[PDB]
Amino acid sequence: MKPKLILMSHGRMAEETLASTQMIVGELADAAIVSMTAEDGLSGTQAKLAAILKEAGNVPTLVLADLKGGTPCNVAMMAMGTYPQLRVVAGLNLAMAIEAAVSPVENVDELAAYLTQIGQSAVTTIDLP
Amino acid sequence: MKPKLILMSHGRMAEETLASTQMIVGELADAAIVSMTAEDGLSGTQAKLAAILKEAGNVPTLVLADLKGGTPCNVAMMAMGTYPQLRVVAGLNLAMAIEAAVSPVENVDELAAYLTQIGQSAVTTIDLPELT
């Protein structure tokens, strides 16, 4: 067993990140997606996430959110008041999604910490000789 | 800003990253995009970036690439041998794109260093306060 994965973003970034991840790891990438439109706002985004979390119930779950302090990330954070096995990591990049897809890490806290280090290590300037 | 921006990725991730950025910072967020499809491979990806870089000439430019070691990033890296004022940062996330879009930083090396720091700081585990 493995935490369930959800990618959340403004607009269609998260949906395309999943699709891009599938170019590298194929069907191993299978996260649920919350794509906040401008029509959604806070309440629409909350409802979208709530439909996913309600359908899963009290199971280890990790949201990879696009951006600290954006409405999608805020909504994921506020859901942690309800779901004790939900964790959230912000700053979604493709390395994080690939590693989340392939990681055998079971524990949701360990997975969050690992993907946090992965995502940070993935950001570098490409420095030529 | 100063440097021209290019976002590059496998698939349409870069494309939608720009769209999301514009919806946060406004219509002034601008970047060229390379979307490497499953049919592109090396030559097609090289050609897509070359069309953009050739159009702009020897102008300070920053590529924000999705993933180190991927073909999009490698293609950007290879272009640096031809374009002396091009730099590349890998690990694109939304915070990096927002900050790039509004940054008034004119020097390319300063801008790459800044966005590297932004992109790393952007990645954190999120917690509700506990104050109850």
Token readout for B97 is: 């794109």
Residues of B in contact with A94 (CB under 8 A): 9-10, 13, 66-67, 70, 92
Work out the minimum CA distance from A55 to partner chain B, whole angstroms.
Answer: 22
Residue A30 is classified by DSSP as -
Chain B residues with CB under 8 Å of A114 CB are none
Distance CA A64, CA A6 (A): 6
DSSP A42: H
Total number of residues shown for chain B: 132
Interface test with B, best of A17, A45, A94 (most B CBs within 10 A): A94
The answer to whether B127 and A77 have CB atoms below 8 angstroms apart is yes
State the fold for domain A3-129.
Rossmann fold (3.40.50)
Order of strands across the sheet that contains A124-125: A124-125, B86-90, B61-65, B4-10, B32-36
Only one residue has tokens 């706002």, namely A41
CB–CB contact A20 B13 (8 Å): yes
For residue A61, the 8-state DSSP code is E
* A29 in Cβ contact with A18 (< 8 Å): yes
* Pairs from B22-26 (Cβ < 8 Å, separation ≥ 24): B22/B101, B23/A10, B23/A11, B23/A38, B24/A10, B24/A70, B24/B94, B24/B98, B25/B98, B25/B101, B25/B102
Number of H helices, E strands in chain B: 5, 5
CB contact under 8 Å between A123 and B113, yes or no, is no
Q: Do B125 and A113 touch (CB under 8 A)?
A: yes
CA angle B100, B29, B112 (to 5 degrees): 15
Strand partners, A34: A8
Question: What are the CA-CA distances from residue B27 to residues A110, B8, B31 (Å)?
Answer: 40, 20, 11
A122 contacts in chain B (CB < 8 Å): 67-68, 90-91
| Angle, vertex CA B119, rays to CA B67 and CA A76, nearest 5 | 95
- Domain range list for chain A: 3-129
SS3 for B50-100, per residue?
Answer: HHHHHHHCCCCEEEEECCCCCHHHHHHHHHCCCCCCEEEEECCCHHHHHHH
- C-alpha separations of A21 from A28, B38, B39, B41, B127 in Å: 9, 12, 16, 16, 26
Sequence-ordered list of residues with C-beta below 8 angstroms from that of A54, at least 6 positions apart, any chain: none
CA dihedral B110, B116, B121, B123 (to 10 degrees): 160
Are B60 and B3 contacting, i.e. CB atoms less than 8 angstroms apart? yes
List the single residue in A with minimal CA-CA distance to B130.
Answer: A81
How many residues does this entry show for chain A? 129
Q: Which residue of A has its CA nearest to B36?
A: A20
- B41 Rama class: left (phi>0) / alpha (psi -120 to 50) / beta: left
Is beta strand B86-90 parallel, antiparallel or unpaired with respect to A124-125? antiparallel
CATH level 2 (architecture), domain B3-132: 3-Layer(aba) Sandwich (3.40)
Q: Solved how? A: X-ray
CA atoms within 13 A on the CB side of B116: 17
Please name the member of A17, A65, A96 whose beta carbon is closest to the beta carbon of B126.
A65
> Can you tell me the distance from the alpha carbon of B81 to that of B76, in angstroms, rounded to the nearest whole number?
10
- Structure-token pair, residue A111: 């997975």
DSSP assignment of A64-100, as one string?
Answer: EESSTTSHHHHHHHHHTTT-TTEEEEES--HHHHHHH
Structure's resolution in angstroms: 1.5
- Report d(CA B92, CA B95) in Å as an integer: 8
CA atoms of A116 and B52, how far apart (whole Å): 33
Shortest distance between the Cα of A82 and any Cα of chain B, in A, equals 11
